[PDB]
Structure 1
Amino acid sequence: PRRRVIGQRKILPDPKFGSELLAKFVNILMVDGKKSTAESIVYSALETLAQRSGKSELEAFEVALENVRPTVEVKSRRVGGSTYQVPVEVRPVRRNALAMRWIVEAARKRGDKSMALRLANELSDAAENKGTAVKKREDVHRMAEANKAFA
């Protein structure tokens, strides 16, 4: 990205619900390239969220997710000697690229017995925005807006 600007590879809208969104989710959660066993845990955790919320599938993900999405974020900036934390209103496409990055990240750092379990409770805490990841939204806003000044 010095000069060679780029687009964004696109992935294969999810083998069950037909969404690209969840297809990035699985990947995010995927590890050592185990797609075979990746969605396995994502569907089962979307299954515990399924009826443990009733609300359904599609829409229960959409909300829980809706919370851990950030609107703004700071961005380093080494100028006259100092690093200068500069706020910048962040784009939609990433606005949840994180939200998912955090939601996944939040569940591994957790006590539940299994990944389906862990992941489930994160979505659910996030449903009522009171989980680890939602806090990462909070502390991200709280980081910018302190740099409210710079703009």
Structure 2
Amino acid sequence: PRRRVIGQRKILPDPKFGSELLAKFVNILMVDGKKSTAESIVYSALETLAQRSGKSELEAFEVALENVRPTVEVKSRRVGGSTYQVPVEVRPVRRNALAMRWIVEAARKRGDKSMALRLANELSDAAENKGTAVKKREDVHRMAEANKAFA
């Protein structure tokens, strides 16, 4: 991307709920090209949150999303030949992407003898703003606030 900026590839909406957000989620935790293997974990870990953790699975998805979304991120760029940790603003769609990418990384360390159980547990815990996933967002914010001197 040096001459023309192509940008991110467009994606089909999720088959079960017709939502691009959840489709990108299954694309972002799919391993080795195993689409059905991943979405069978996704839909179960959302059904479990539907019945007990909240009232609606699709909206609980968002209430956990914006509960882990970061706002200001240090993207290290040397302006004039000095290591400057300049803080820049994330775009909305990249914000959602970072959020889901962090929530899947949180579910990975959960253990709990399952994958659906981990995803459900951490998606809930993040929706309540008390999850291993939210700490990385506030650490991004900590590192953004430390390096304010370079604005």
> How many Å separate the matches in 1 of 2:70 and 2:98?
8
Q: Per-residue deviation at 1:65?
A: 1.1
TM-score (norm. length: structure 1): 0.94
TM-score (norm. length: structure 2): 0.94
Q: Per-residue deviation at 1:80?
A: 5.0
> How many Å separate the matches in 2 of 1:121 and 1:40?
16
**Alignment RMSD (CA, Å):** 1.2
For the residue of structure 2 that corresponds to 1:99, the secondary structure is helix
The answer on whether the counterparts of 2:46 and 2:58 sit within 8 Å (CA) in structure 1 is: no
Q: Per-residue deviation at 1:9?
A: 1.6
Q: How many residues align?
A: 151
Deviations 1:77-126 (A, max 9, x none): 13555321110011101011010000011101122111100001110110
Deviations 1:40-76 (A, max 9, x none): 0000000111112232112111101111101110011
> How many Å separate the matches in 2 of 1:32 and 1:89?
32
Q: Per-residue deviation at 1:8?
A: 2.5
Aligned to 1:90: 90
Aligned to 2:6: 6
132-141 vs 73-82, which moves further: 73-82
Residue 146 of structure 2 corresponds to residue 146 of structure 1: yes
Among the aligned pairs, what percent are the same residue? 100
Q: Per-residue deviation at 1:7?
A: 3.1
Deviations 1:5-52 (A, max 9, x none): 113321110010000111110011100001121110000000111112
Aligned to 1:137: 137
> How many Å separate the matches in 2 of 1:108 and 1:27?
16
Q: Per-residue deviation at 1:3?
A: 1.4
The answer on whether the counterparts of 2:64 and 2:128 sit within 8 Å (CA) in structure 1 is: yes
For the residue of structure 1 that corresponds to 2:87, the secondary structure is strand
> How many Å separate the matches in 2 of 1:52 and 1:22?
20
Q: Which consecutive residues of structure 1, in runs of 5 or more, have no partner in the other structure?
A: none
Q: Which consecutive residues of structure 2, in runs of 5 or more, have no partner in the other structure?
A: none
> How many Å separate the matches in 1 of 2:82 and 2:119?
39
